[PDB]
């Protein structure tokens, strides 16, 4: 059962891979499964963020898109800020008290 | 200052010595690590009471003029004592030996904090403690603890 | 921006290291 | 004794701030107050209370009983010093100075504590004294004095393992991180929930369970909810004693959005009435709403707005005014259409939103070194 | 002008280099080492040495005659 | 020093931002949702 | 006159310190006449290099305030106008310090209270810089020129000189003027549209005199129209107690631009037959025109289907590669380099008592050549 | 009311004077808004027929709409106002930041190594 979840999702990442968009009626046919549990299960993929994308309610187009965003540049310069703020707080303790 | 380092670093090395003790007329007795004892002088910038027995020194090498006091080396008890590495202890790790604590306080604690308290009774202070029992029973940690 | 952001604070710390070298030298020496 | 001493402060909160609810609290709090030698902490609580005109003899019998405990310290210090033990004076009031701390105020409880701090060469007394200073540093909410002995506390656990002095300690730091709105740290200090014990201050371990789930449901994401709080046997069985919180947690996890708000009013109102959550329950559910909106709304792109009433939570114009202030609040990354009656989503790449906090902190430190550079050198 | 003097001083660290071992310093930038000849000395040091590279029990370099840190 | 001519005469701040946003909005939810149950 | 101006002031103070306006205005007045005879001997007779002028610009300046607190509001100030133009005329010729400073805020303080032309005269004035005016007149001076462009239409020019006037102000009490720069400093940024939390430092300033004025910006942070009127009737007189009310009256523009940025950001395809009702505008027929000029003046971009009624708005993301935040940098790159430069320029005064760079010695050099001569012969 | 998008209300005050004539001032004011509405023909609009923007000022059908429709665009057509909403030419310029920014980088280098 739990192995069937990982096998279900192993197929579910397999067939979803080569495209950007599809209708749910073809992937239901291509995994040979329903559309409601597949729609909810794809929703759980984009709730648990293991797969990311978007879904549609009018016809069920799954828009798939990915890029790895720049992350290292801004936050690692941002925690240096809150280091140095505390450093200036220590500058009270040798500057404001002293002279 | 920086150009001066090219010149002053041409000066030769400084010996290190070891004061036994001083004698008359501004002189001391100093022995090297593996090299014999010398009766040498002091410089003007060194006081005789500031010269301690059992203390290292800086020494110039050409005339063996006393240069500078080498800080301190070790106690002869801290050295060997550490070599032993007894497991230091406290009251807070004592498991249920409370009356033994109260006995040993009476023998040891009282003739330190209250030596007069035995002059209050006109009796001599105790000197010796015998501790016995099976091993593994807290002898070492209590003895270190006190 | 980060490099210039540090550098000012460093030199400020250095000036505090100067005002300790001023205020507790004027009364001591004269 | 400081072990029942937090419920006293919580019932001070229960006395004053619910204004209509001011009768049984001035009953049971007096019921604890004019016994167990309590004299000092309730004069202004009597001012907020009624008259209670004849309290004179009630204070006199208890300052008298307090005078007995002080005069027997005065009976103790001199036989303690004639034959000296481990400074038996400070060994007496190293334990009865906490009686001076509950019964006396923080001064006789503080000094004597910093006094006896220099007595015991081992931290087995010292760090528990520090725990007492932490607990009074909570009672008087001494938010700077807790900063000292938290570090002075932590400085002692490195020698030893002292997991009764660290896992107990993390309960204190979790209560401070949930005192302030620091919830990713509050659940992080609340991470274990096993070595945490059936405490004195959360005498229900399950109250501690409710607190760590309420902070964790904001603090961690799904990849952590769908492994961590859903697979803990230590967490599942204790809320198996809970119907509501079990439903309240699972209504988000099982996508049960309509019954979610139903329990949200109850849990949020309980958090309203609760002490120490009363500063921040608004901050709680304003995040819970936009979290539940964002969670469903990052699944669909072309979901209409008249979908979410019958399925998500009722009131179409209520959804309208609630979403409009969240997109208009600058979060809830989407874009709502109106007169074709459809909600669209978008995606912000992490290049603008990540930039925003950078310029915020840069402006803040700019203000900081601006202000200091004006302050020093005249 | 100063940068002429700056790299100029390092001629002493030419090549006829004997080996000591660092022991401690009295103060800033003047120290005591233990030579591989067995004897110990009160020596001076090159200024460009990062002093925070010193003391696991530091393998240091001594001038063969003037007997200072290299 | 400080002559200062007179022409006229945490605990607070996290509480102040939630005071800013959480300002004048219904104040008393135990009944608003329980009355939207049947009306909405 | 260092003796006779100090021995003028030293009795010119304690009369007028408590003020004693009962049979003390003529004694004060005649004592000011005697000090004015000393002041005319200062204006005429050998002020060169003695601090006759400079030392008594402090005495003259400080006696301008008691002079200005008996001899301004009770007496005629407009004579002290031309006396002050003459005092400025003899200033800046013989000496450029201490007369370039006080004679301009002391010129400003009733012209601001008036509506005389001398704001543009203060534009074309040379003495706008008095060159390091002692951080008290200098500090308040930037405020005194801040309210100039307040009444002459802040275009975000002087909110930095209000901020700068604030950060150069001392630690004494806020009730002096620091209330009014704390109020007026943002009053001009409410004119822009930006607003922080003001009440964040509740010392002796953020509890007393805010509640109408924070209650004002409480309405401004809403997108409501007549809520502004619900403030403006409630404390129309309180804002007239200071005299800011003519700047208060013009905020309906920024309220409605706040609203149109709010809605235009919030909704996307929204009818104009909704926004008049939601903004309680009571007329959609000119809500074509407020929206239309909201397009015209900049603010919002996209189109109105004026035939249909929906106002569409496009999704404009990726403002990063739009080269605005490079400018948000370069404003602060240059300035942060400058404050490092000032942390250099303020730093190098210390460098002193560097008496002698002694190379090695002389006599030990003679011993080095001596023992060197022994080893050289050896 | 001339601050915000209040048009119609201003044209209501044009005629609703209680004080006196004010006529020479509301005729300068009758013009300085004439070129302003002539400004806001030029906003991103759809086809407007010869009724809507014909009656936004105060005219039924004179050749004053030929004066504006030949003054600016939104050209007189088959009940039509033409939208030349192009706004296309100005973007995609690297060279002006490559001039100004290359000035500013040397400006960075001035107070960076060389003493000030
Ligand atoms: N009362 C006690 N409390 C805690 N540990 C004890 C106690 N008694 C013995 N031990 C353990 O036994 C060892 C000490 O042995 P001890 O009795 O002190 O010396 P010996 O075994 O040589 O007589 C320690 O490692 C200690 O932890």
For the beta carbon of residue A26, count every other beta carbon within 10 angstroms: 12
Length of chain C in terms of residues written: 30
Give the integer Cα–Cα distance in Å for B86 and B140.
9
Tokens standing for B113? Answer: 């904090």
Give which of H76, H73, H78, H39 is closest to H56, Cα–Cα. H39
In three state form, how does the secondary structure of chain G look? Answer: CCCCCHHHHHHHHHHHHCCCCCCCHHHHHHHHHHHHHHHHHHHHCCCCCCCHHHHHHHHHHHHHHHHHHHCCCCCCCHHHHHHHHHHHHHCCCCCCCCCCCHHHHHHHHHHCCCCCCCCHHHHCCCCCCCCCCCCCHHHHHHHHCHHHHHHCCCCCCCHHHHHHHHHCCCCCCCCCCHHHHHHHHHHHHHCCCCCCCCCCCCCCCCCCCCHHHHHHHHHHCCCCCCHHHHHHCCCCCHHHHHCCHHHHCCCHHHHHHHHHHHHHHHECCEEHHHHHHHCCCCCCCCHHHHHHHHHHCCCCCCCECCCCCEECCCCCCCCCCCCCHHHHHHHHHHHHHHHHHHHHHCCCCCCCCCCCCCCCCCHHHHHHHHHHHHHHHC
What residues contact E51, with CB distance under 8 A and at least 6 apart?
A: E28, E29
Which of G152, G163, G209 minimizes the C-alpha distance to G186?
Answer: G163
How many A from CA of B126 to the centre of ligand 1?
25
Buried b (16+ CB within 10 A) or exposed e, B84-106: eeeeebebeeeeeeeebbeebbe
Minimal C-alpha gap between D119 and chain B (Å): 12
Among G223, G284, G317, which would you mutate to test the D interface (most chain D Cβ atoms within 10 Å of its Cβ)? G317
- Residue linked to tokens 């725990």: D131
Chains near H (3 or more Cβ pairs under 8 Å)? G
G266–D336 CB contact, under 8 Å:
yes
Tokens representing G110?
Answer: 């009733």
Other Cβ atoms less than 10 A from the Cβ of B14: the count is: 22
d(CA E59, CA E67): 15
Q: Residue D259 in contact with residue D271, Cβ under 8 Å?
A: no
Taking alpha carbons only, the member of G6, D122, D368 closest to residue A88 is: D368
The number of angstroms, rounded, from the C-alpha of H94 to the middle of its chain's C-alpha atoms is: 29
What 3-state DSSP class applies to A80?
helix
Query: Position of tokens 């033409």?
Result: H82
**Which strands make up the sheet holding B55-59, listed edge to edge?**
B37-41, B27-31, B15-23, B55-59, B66-70
The method recorded for this entry reads cryo-EM
Q: What's the CA gap between D81 and C27, in Å, rounded?
A: 47
Instruction: Name the nearest CA neighbour of B51 among B16, B93, B21.
Output: B21
> Hey, how many other C-beta atoms are within 10 angstroms of the C-beta on G333?
18
- B145: Cβ below 6 Å to ligand 1? no
**Distance between CA atoms of residues F28 and F20, nearest Å:** 17
β-pairing, D334-337 with D342-345?
antiparallel
Q: How far apart are CA G19 and CA G28, in angstroms?
A: 9
Residue nearest to atom 22 of ligand 1 (CA): B135
Task: Tell me how close the Cα of A67 comes to any Cα of chain C, in angstroms.
Answer: 27
CA angle A42, A46, A52 (to 5 degrees): 105
Classified as helix, coil or strand, H27 is helix
- CA B95 to ligand 1 center in whole angstroms: 9
CB contact under 8 A, G334 and H48: no
Angle at A51 between CA A50 and CA A52, to 5 degrees: 120
Resolution (A): 4.4
**Rounded to an integer, what distance in angstroms lies between the CA atom of residue B40 and that of residue B18?**
12
Contact G359 B8 (CB under 8 A): yes
Chain D CA closest to residue G166:
D371
Comparing alpha-carbon positions, the chain D residue that sits nearest to G263 is D328
Q: Who contacts H54 (Cβ-Cβ below 8 Å, separation ≥6)? A: H60, H61, H65
CA separation for the pair G256, G279 (Å, rounded): 8
- Helices then strands, each counted (H, E), chain D: 22, 2
Interchain contact, A98 vs C23, CB within 8 Å: yes
F contact chains, 3+ CB pairs < 8 A = D, G
Interface check C5 vs A, CB under 8 A: yes
Q: How many CA atoms lie within 13 A of H70 on its CB side?
A: 4
Does the beta carbon of B135 lie inside 6 Å of ligand 1?
A: yes
Question: Are B90 and D121 within 8 A, CB to CB?
Answer: yes
Ligand 1 centroid to Cα of residue E47, in Å, is: 53
Q: Is the dihedral of CA B73, B74, B75, B77 positive or negative?
A: negative
Atom 27 of ligand 1, nearest CA residue: B138
Locus of tokens 């109105």 = G304
3-class state of residue H88 by DSSP: coil
- Identity of the residue in F11, F14, F36 whose CB atom sits nearest the CB atom of D181: F14
Count of other CB atoms within 10 angstroms of residue E63: 23
Q: Report the C-alpha gap between A45 and D299 in whole angstroms.
A: 9
In the three-class reduction of DSSP (H, G, I as helix; E, B as strand; rest coil), residue D23 is classed as coil
Q: How far is the CA of B75 from the centre of ligand 1 (A)?
A: 29
Q: Is there a contact between G200 and F12 if contact means CB atoms under 8 Å apart?
A: yes
Structure token pair of residue F24: 């004048």
Q: Which of B88, B91, B101, B112 to mutate to test the interface with D (most CBs of D within 10 A)?
A: B91
Residue H5 touches partner G, C-beta closer than 8 Å: yes
Chain B contact for G373 (CB, 8 A cutoff)? no
| DSSP 8-state assignment for residue D345 | E
- Non-local (6+) Cβ contacts of B34 within 8 A are E38, E39
Q: Which two tokens stand for residue D353?
A: 């939103």
CA atoms within 13 A on the CB side of G378: 6
* CB contacts, 8 Å: D362 with chain C: 1, 5
Q: Is residue D322 within 8 Å of D289, Cβ to Cβ?
A: yes
List CB contacts (< 8 A) between G298 and chain H. Answer: none
Dihedral pair phi/psi, residue A39, rounded to 5°: -70, -45
């Amino acid at each position: 059962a739990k192995l069937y979840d990982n096998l279900l999702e192993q197929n579910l990442i397999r067939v979803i891979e080569p495209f950007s968009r599809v209708q749910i009626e073809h992937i239901s046919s291509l995994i040979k499964l329903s559309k409601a549990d597949v729609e909810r299960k794809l929703s759980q993929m984009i709730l648990d963020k293991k797969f990311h994308g978007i879904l549609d309610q009018g016809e069920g187009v799954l828009i798939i898109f990915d890029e790895p965003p720049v992350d290292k540049t801004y936050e690692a310069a941002l925690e240096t800020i809150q280091n140095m703020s505390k450093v200036v707080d220590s500058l009270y303790n040798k500057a404001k008290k002293l002279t | 200052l920086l150009r001066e380092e090219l010149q002053l670093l041409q000066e030769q090395g400084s010996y290190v010595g070891e004061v036994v003790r001083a004698m008359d007329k501004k002189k001391v007795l100093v022995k090297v690590h593996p090299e014999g004892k010398f009766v040498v002088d002091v410089d003007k910038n060194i006081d005789i009471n500031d010269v301690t027995p059992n203390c290292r020194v800086a020494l110039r090498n050409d005339s063996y003029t006393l240069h500078k006091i080498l800080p301190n080396k070790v106690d002869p008890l801290v050295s060997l004592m550490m070599v032993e590495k007894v497991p230091d202890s406290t009251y807070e790790m004592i498991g249920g030996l409370d009356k033994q604590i109260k006995e040993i306080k009476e023998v040891i604690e009282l003739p330190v904090k209250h030596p007069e308290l035995f002059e209050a009774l006109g009796i001599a202070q105790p000197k010796g403690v015998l501790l016995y029992g099976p091993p593994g029973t807290g002898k070492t940690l209590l003895a270190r603890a006190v | 921006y980060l490099a210039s952001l540090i550098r000012s604070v460093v030199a400020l710390h250095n000036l505090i290291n100067n005002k300790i070298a001023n205020r507790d030298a004027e009364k001591k020496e004269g | 004794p400081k072990n029942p001493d937090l419920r006293i402060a919580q019932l001070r909160f229960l006395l004053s701030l619910p204004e209509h609810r001011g009768d049984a609290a001035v009953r049971d709090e007096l019921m604890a107050a004019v016994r167990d030698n309590n004299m000092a902490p309730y004069y202004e609580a009597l001012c907020k209370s009624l008259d209670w005109q004849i309290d004179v003899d009630l204070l006199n019998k208890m300052k008298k009983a307090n005078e007995d405990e002080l005069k027997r310290l005065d009976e103790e210090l001199e036989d303690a010093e004639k034959n000296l033990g481990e400074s038996e004076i400070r060994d007496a009031m190293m334990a009865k100075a906490e009686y001076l701390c509950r019964i006396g105020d923080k001064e006789g409880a503080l000094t004597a504590f910093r006094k006896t701090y220099d007595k015991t060469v081992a931290l087995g007394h010292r760090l528990d004294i520090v725990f007492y200073l932490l607990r009074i540093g909570l009672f008087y909410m001494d938010n700077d004095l807790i900063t000292r002995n938290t570090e002075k506390a932590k400085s002692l656990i490195e020698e030893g393992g002292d997991w009764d002095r660290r896992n107990r300690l993390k309960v204190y730091q979790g209560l401070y991180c949930v005192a302030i709105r620091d919830f990713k740290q509050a659940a992080e200090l609340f991470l274990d929930t096993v070595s945490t014990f059936t405490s004195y201050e959360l005498m229900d371990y399950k109250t501690f369970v409710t607190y760590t789930v309420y902070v964790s449901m904001i603090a961690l994401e799904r990849p952590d909810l769908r492994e961590k709080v859903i697979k803990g046997a230590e967490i599942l069985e204790v809320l198996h004693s809970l119907p509501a919180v079990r439903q309240y947690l699972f209504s988000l996890y099982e996508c049960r959005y309509s019954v979610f708000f139903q329990s949200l009013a109850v849990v949020e109102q309980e958090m309203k009435k609760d002490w120490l959550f009363a500063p921040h329950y608004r901050y709680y559910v304003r995040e819970m709403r936009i979290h539940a909106y964002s969670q469903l709304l990052e699944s669909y792109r072309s979901l209409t707005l008249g979908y979410m009433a019958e399925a998500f939570g009722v009131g179409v114009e209520f959804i309208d005014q609630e979403l409009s202030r969240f997109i208009a609040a600058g979060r809830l990354h989407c874009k709502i259409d109106k007169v074709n009656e459809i909600v669209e989503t978008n995606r912000p790449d992490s290049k603008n939103w990540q930039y925003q906090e950078t310029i915020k902190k840069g402006d803040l430190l700019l203000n900081r070194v601006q202000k200091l550079s004006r302050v020093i050198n005249m | 002008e100063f940068l002429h003097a700056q790299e100029e001083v390092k001629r002493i660290q030419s090549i006829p280099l004997v080996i000591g071992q660092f022991l401690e310093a009295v103060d800033q930038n003047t120290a005591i080492v233990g030579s591989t000849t067995g004897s110990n000395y009160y020596v001076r040091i090159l200024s460009t040495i990062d002093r925070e590279l010193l003391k696991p029990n530091a393998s240091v370099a001594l001038h063969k005659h003037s007997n200072a840190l290299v | 020093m400080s002559e200062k001519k007179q022409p006229v005469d945490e605990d607070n701040w996290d509480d102040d931002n939630v005071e800013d946003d959480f300002s004048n909005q219904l104040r008393a939810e135990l009944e608003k949702h329980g009355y939207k149950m049947e009306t909405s | 006159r260092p003796r006779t101006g100090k021995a003028a002031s030293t009795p010119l103070l304690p009369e007028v310190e408590a003020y004693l306006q009962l049979l003390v205005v003529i004694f004060m007045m005649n004592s000011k006449r005697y000090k004015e005879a000393q002041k005319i001997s200062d204006d005429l007779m050998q002020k060169i290099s003695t601090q006759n002028r400079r030392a008594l610009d402090l005495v003259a300046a400080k006696c301008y305030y008691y002079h200005a607190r008996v001899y301004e509001f009770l007496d005629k100030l407009d004579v002290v106008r031309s006396f002050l133009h003459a005092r400025l005329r003899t200033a800046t010729l013989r000496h450029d310090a201490d007369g370039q400073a006080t004679l301009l805020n002391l010129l400003l303080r009733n012209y601001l209270h008036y509506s005389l032309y001398d704001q543009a005269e203060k534009l074309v004035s040379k003495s706008v810089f008095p060159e390091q005016a002692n951080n008290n007149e200098w500090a308040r001076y930037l405020y005194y020129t801040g309210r100039i462009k307040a009444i002459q239409l802040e275009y975000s020019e002087a909110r930095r000189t209000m901020t700068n006037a604030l950060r150069k102000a001392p630690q004494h009490t806020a009730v002096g003027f620091k209330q009014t720069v704390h109020k007026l400093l943002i009053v001009v940024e409410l004119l822009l549209g930006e607003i922080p939390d003001r009440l964040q430092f509740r010392q002796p300033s953020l509890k007393r005199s805010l509640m109408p004025y924070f209650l004002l910006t409480q309405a401004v942070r809403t997108g409501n129209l007549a809520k502004f009127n619900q403030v403006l009737d409630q404390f129309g007189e309180k804002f007239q107690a200071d005299g800011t009310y003519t700047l208060i009256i013009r905020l309906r523009h920024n309220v409605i631009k706040t609203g149109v940025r709010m809605i235009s950001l919030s909704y996307s395809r929204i009818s104009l037959a909704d926004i008049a009702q939601k903004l309680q505008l009571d007329s959609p027929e000119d809500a074509e025109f407020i929206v239309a000029k909201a397009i015209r003046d900049g603010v919002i971009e996209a189109s109105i289907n004026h035939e249909k009624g929906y106002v569409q708005s496009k999704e404009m993301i990726d403002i990063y590669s739009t080269r605005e935040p490079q400018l948000a940098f370069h404003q602060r790159i240059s300035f942060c380099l400058d404050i490092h430069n000032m942390s250099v320029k303020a730093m190098r005064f210390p460098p002193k008592s560097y008496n002698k760079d002694l190379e090695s010695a002389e006599e030990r050099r003679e011993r080095e050549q001596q023992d060197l001569e022994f080893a050289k012969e050896m | 009311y001339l601050m915000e998008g209040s048009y119609n209300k201003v044209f209501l005050a044009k005629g609703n004077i209680p004080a006196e004539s004010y006529t020479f001032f509301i005729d300068i004011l009758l013009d300085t808004i004439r070129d302003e509405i002539a400004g806001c023909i030029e906003k991103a609009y759809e086809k407007i027929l010869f009724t809507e923007a014909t009656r936004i000022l105060f005219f039924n059908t004179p050749k004053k709409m030929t004066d504006y429709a030949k003054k600016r665009g939104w050209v007189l057509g088959p009940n039509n106002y033409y939208s030349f909403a192009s706004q296309q030419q100005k973007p995609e310029d690297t060279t002006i930041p490559s001039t100004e920014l290359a000035k500013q980088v040397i400006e960075y280098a001035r107070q960076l190594e060389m003493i000030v």
